Amino acid sequence: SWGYREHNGPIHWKEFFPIADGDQQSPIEIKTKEVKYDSSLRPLSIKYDPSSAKIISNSGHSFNVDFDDTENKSVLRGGPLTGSYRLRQVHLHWGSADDHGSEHIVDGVSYAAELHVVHWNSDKYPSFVEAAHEPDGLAVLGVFLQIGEPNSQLQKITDTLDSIKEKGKQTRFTNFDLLSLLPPSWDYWTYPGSLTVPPLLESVTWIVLKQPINISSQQLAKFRSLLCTAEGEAAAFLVSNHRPPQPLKGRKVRASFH
């Protein structure tokens, strides 16, 4: 089964998921000299209902906070998007060191970690599973994290981690103020790409926010204490879960700002 260890990590994924070498894979290096400003891009419009959050689980690959997705209470519109994209879940990527944990990189620079907020096109498709197999199906908001003052919604997450240490565990999680994990500037970059985990489907419109938010070193370290293994298996720790940047293959990265 896939993971981030030496014999099941990113370089091996193509052995089971051939789309790993596809032409629209993520993450990428954003090269600001090649980024094109586009005045047709719209500002992001976001609304996340804190009571939309239901549970947090350990997938063995990250934590996932899952949201009720039967209504348009928590939705993302505008940006590069056509129509309404319904919030499905949030999760985080990090690395074994505090200065090299993000998925996307900007002009050579890695951030400490990278938060992804996953949405699906509910104006066109009947569920997230269906949306995940279409080019305009999903939209993921990426927010970088840098070492700084602790965020209280990140503490709300890290307080749960002891209860979800083993893969498959979950616990109630609601009244989650997700909008608190967005930076005050919503300037962004956007490009067409993929899930960064197997099955690596090329269905994602990426929207990567330029400004980072802050996490403490203590908060960040608590994520590395999650296991990628299940209860009563030999313990292995999720000390890193970021995929390297993938070939751009000519894709256009657009900026909302200049």
Ligand SMILES: NS(=O)(=O)c1c(F)c(F)c(S(=O)(=O)CCO)c(N[C@H](c2ccccc2)[C@@H](O)c2ccccc2)c1F
């Ligand atoms: N970095 S990314 O934004 O591209 C990303 C991740 F990094 C990520 F860790 C997940 S995950 O849900 O946290 C565990 C691996 O599936 C999903 N979520 C979906 C999922 C949830 C539960 C079980 C399987 C899959 C996603 O993996 C998915 C959903 C439906 C169809 C294909 C894939 C995801 F989209």
Ligand SMILES: [Zn+2]
């Ligand atoms: Zn992700």
